[PDB]
Write an enzyme that holds these catalytic residues in place. Sequence first.
Site, short mmCIF file in Angstrom:
data_model
loop_
_atom_site.label_atom_id
_atom_site.label_comp_id
_atom_site.label_asym_id
_atom_site.label_seq_id
_atom_site.Cartn_x
_atom_site.Cartn_y
_atom_site.Cartn_z
N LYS A 211 48.19 46.41 37.56
CA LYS A 211 49.42 47.03 38.04
C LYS A 211 50.55 46.96 37.01
O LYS A 211 51.21 47.95 36.75
CB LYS A 211 49.84 46.40 39.37
CG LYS A 211 48.83 46.56 40.48
CD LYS A 211 49.27 45.98 41.79
CE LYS A 211 49.56 44.50 41.78
NZ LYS A 211 48.40 43.66 41.37
N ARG B 266 54.02 42.21 49.62
CA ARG B 266 52.83 41.34 49.63
C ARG B 266 52.37 40.92 51.02
O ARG B 266 51.31 40.35 51.16
CB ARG B 266 53.04 40.10 48.78
CG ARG B 266 53.23 40.43 47.31
CD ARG B 266 51.97 40.87 46.58
NE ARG B 266 51.28 39.81 45.87
CZ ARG B 266 51.54 39.42 44.62
NH1 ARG B 266 52.58 39.88 43.96
NH2 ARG B 266 50.76 38.50 44.07
N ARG C 207 45.23 36.69 30.21
CA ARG C 207 46.50 37.41 30.18
C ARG C 207 47.52 36.63 29.35
O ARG C 207 47.62 35.41 29.44
CB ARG C 207 47.01 37.63 31.60
CG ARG C 207 48.37 38.31 31.68
CD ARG C 207 48.66 38.94 33.03
NE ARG C 207 48.67 37.97 34.10
CZ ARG C 207 48.78 38.30 35.38
NH1 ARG C 207 48.85 39.57 35.76
NH2 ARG C 207 48.83 37.34 36.28
N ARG D 31 50.94 32.45 31.40
CA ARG D 31 51.66 32.09 32.60
C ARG D 31 51.11 30.82 33.22
O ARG D 31 49.89 30.58 33.22
CB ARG D 31 51.59 33.21 33.62
CG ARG D 31 52.48 34.38 33.31
CD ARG D 31 52.12 35.62 34.08
NE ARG D 31 51.89 35.37 35.50
CZ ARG D 31 51.81 36.33 36.42
NH1 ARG D 31 52.03 37.61 36.11
NH2 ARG D 31 51.48 36.02 37.66
N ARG E 81 45.26 32.58 44.59
CA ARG E 81 46.00 33.83 44.62
C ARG E 81 45.15 34.99 45.14
O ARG E 81 45.63 35.87 45.83
CB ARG E 81 46.49 34.16 43.21
CG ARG E 81 47.59 33.25 42.78
CD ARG E 81 47.70 33.12 41.30
NE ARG E 81 47.89 34.40 40.61
CZ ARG E 81 47.71 34.58 39.31
NH1 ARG E 81 47.28 33.58 38.54
NH2 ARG E 81 47.87 35.76 38.77
N1 LIG Z 1 56.46 40.10 46.86
C1 LIG Z 1 56.18 38.82 46.70
N2 LIG Z 1 56.23 37.97 47.75
C2 LIG Z 1 56.00 36.67 47.61
N3 LIG Z 1 55.65 36.06 46.48
C3 LIG Z 1 55.61 36.84 45.41
C4 LIG Z 1 55.88 38.25 45.43
N4 LIG Z 1 55.76 38.75 44.16
C5 LIG Z 1 55.42 37.70 43.40
N5 LIG Z 1 55.31 36.57 44.14
C6 LIG Z 1 54.99 35.22 43.62
O1 LIG Z 1 54.74 35.32 42.22
C7 LIG Z 1 53.36 35.02 41.92
C8 LIG Z 1 52.84 35.91 40.82
O2 LIG Z 1 52.84 37.27 41.28
P1 LIG Z 1 52.88 38.46 40.23
O3 LIG Z 1 53.86 38.19 39.17
O4 LIG Z 1 53.01 39.69 41.06
O5 LIG Z 1 51.48 38.37 39.50
P2 LIG Z 1 50.00 38.94 39.87
O6 LIG Z 1 50.09 40.39 39.39
O7 LIG Z 1 49.05 38.16 39.05
O8 LIG Z 1 49.84 38.84 41.34
C9 LIG Z 1 52.67 35.19 43.26
O9 LIG Z 1 51.39 34.56 43.32
C10 LIG Z 1 53.72 34.65 44.22
O10 LIG Z 1 53.80 33.23 44.13
N1 LIG Z 2 41.76 48.45 32.73
C1 LIG Z 2 41.83 47.23 32.20
N2 LIG Z 2 40.78 46.68 31.58
C2 LIG Z 2 40.82 45.46 31.05
N3 LIG Z 2 41.86 44.63 31.06
C3 LIG Z 2 42.95 45.14 31.66
C4 LIG Z 2 43.02 46.42 32.27
N4 LIG Z 2 44.24 46.61 32.81
C5 LIG Z 2 44.92 45.49 32.52
N5 LIG Z 2 44.15 44.60 31.83
C6 LIG Z 2 44.49 43.23 31.42
O1 LIG Z 2 44.14 42.37 32.50
C7 LIG Z 2 45.23 41.50 32.82
C8 LIG Z 2 45.78 41.85 34.18
O2 LIG Z 2 46.52 43.08 34.12
P1 LIG Z 2 47.96 43.18 34.79
O3 LIG Z 2 48.43 44.55 34.47
O4 LIG Z 2 48.78 42.02 34.43
O5 LIG Z 2 47.52 43.08 36.35
P2 LIG Z 2 48.45 42.90 37.67
O6 LIG Z 2 49.87 43.26 37.29
O7 LIG Z 2 47.79 43.83 38.68
O8 LIG Z 2 48.28 41.44 38.04
C9 LIG Z 2 46.22 41.63 31.69
O9 LIG Z 2 45.94 40.60 30.73
C10 LIG Z 2 45.95 43.02 31.12
O10 LIG Z 2 46.20 43.11 29.73
#
Ligand SMILES: Nc1ncnc2c1ncn2[C@@H]1O[C@H](COP(=O)(O)OP(=O)(O)O)[C@@H](O)[C@H]1O
Ligand SMILES: Nc1ncnc2c1ncn2[C@@H]1O[C@H](COP(=O)(O)OP(=O)(O)O)[C@@H](O)[C@H]1O
Length: 213
Positions: free
Chosen positions: A13, A88, A127, A160, A171
């Site tokens: 995303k 979420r 990542r 991270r 998660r």
């Molecule tokens: N909309 C949301 N509501 C609650 N917690 C959130 C939300 N967005 C992010 N978080 C918090 O931040 C953490 C990382 O989320 P995010 O940055 O979206 O990474 P990822 O794409 O790996 O889920 C979540 O596991 C949660 O603890």
């Molecule tokens: N299509 C893909 N194939 C392989 N790796 C990807 C792809 N899209 C994203 N990634 C990688 O995988 C990880 C998760 O992507 P990210 O965009 O952070 O996901 P989200 O925001 O849904 O948690 C990052 O390290 C990113 O560089």
Amino acid sequence: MNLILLGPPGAGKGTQAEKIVEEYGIPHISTGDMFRAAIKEGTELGLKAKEYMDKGELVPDEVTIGLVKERLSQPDCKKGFLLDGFPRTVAQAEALDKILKELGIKLDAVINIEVPREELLERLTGRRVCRQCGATYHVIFNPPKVEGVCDKCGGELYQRSDDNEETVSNRLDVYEDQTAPLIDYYEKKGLLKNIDGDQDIDAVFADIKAALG
Ligand SMILES: Nc1ncnc2c1ncn2[C@@H]1O[C@H](COP(=O)(O)OP(=O)(O)O)[C@@H](O)[C@H]1O
Ligand SMILES: Nc1ncnc2c1ncn2[C@@H]1O[C@H](COP(=O)(O)OP(=O)(O)O)[C@@H](O)[C@H]1O
Ligand SMILES: [Zn+2]
């Protein structure tokens, strides 16, 4: 374009959001990025949010909703925006509908990026994110041009604090329990489009562009 991206942690995303907001010239609204900025700044909010984040738990709904309401109320959101990581929970989705109604804004599309769970762990533990601008990379799937340095701002890349195997498992469990049901919520609006995220980055983007066009 008023857009939401849905899908599990690691689905791509944030990566796709960077491409979409460049294509449309709209803000990227990521609740995770807001929390990480708060942590970087050492705020009380950040430090408290980190306690949830590091356990892989969701930050509570009301505080998160309030942050998004404030952000969406800014003038830069009048001509479009991209929500990435919010909502979420169903409570957040309902609250978002109320926020948008109060602002006189209607959603255009909800993009659901589908990726098999088995692919997600390696995406997440590999990542790397920019300290200064939040750009997302991967040690092998999407590296920076220069190792450890952000292409956009020159900032240092880091892993991270939540991108470790134990926390990832939790998660993903939280996603399945709380967040996956949002697919039905947005299907009811007639706005949802499903995208195969099990492709290379540029192929996923191509499919998103085709769906939005
Ligand atoms: N909309 C949301 N509501 C609650 N917690 C959130 C939300 N967005 C992010 N978080 C918090 O931040 C953490 C990382 O989320 P995010 O940055 O979206 O990474 P990822 O794409 O790996 O889920 C979540 O596991 C949660 O603890
Ligand atoms: N299509 C893909 N194939 C392989 N790796 C990807 C792809 N899209 C994203 N990634 C990688 O995988 C990880 C998760 O992507 P990210 O965009 O952070 O996901 P989200 O925001 O849904 O948690 C990052 O390290 C990113 O560089
Ligand atoms: Zn950067």
